[PDB]
Every structure is written in structure tokens, then in C-alpha cells.
Amino acid sequence: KGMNDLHLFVRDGRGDLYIPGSSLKGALRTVLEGAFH
């Protein structure tokens, strides 16, 4: 069979794959809550 919809990863201007700090910060805030500067 064949694929349908593809979700693209995040890549910076240099063109490399990287996990953004903000996404890690959000996850650690969801876990850690209960200003995170």
C-alpha cells in the first residue's frame, strides 16, 4: 500500500534536525508545575 499524509520534522536555517529547547521546556513545565525563568 501507499502513504497518505506526512508530518515534517523541525529543521533550522542551517538545515539540521534539532529538538527545540522550548518544546523540552514546555514538557518539563507540565511535569514540574505545582515563572520557570
Added chain:
RNA sequence: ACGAGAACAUGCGCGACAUUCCGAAGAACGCUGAAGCG
């Protein structure tokens, strides 16, 4: 046939000289591209 008749309140002269509208000051604080799954 007048305390009168003439008789320029005038002449030369710069509102000018010295001056920083500066001094101090993060456009940053928080913010998962993610939720449901038809």
C-alpha cells in the same frame, strides 16, 4: 519789530563672548506545534 535770531541730542560704537539637549537604561517576561481520532 515776540529774551529774540539762526543752531539735527548728535558722532563712534556687532546683544556679544564661553556652552555636546546630555547622563543612566537588554524589546524581554511567561508560552511543548499540540489535542481528539476517525
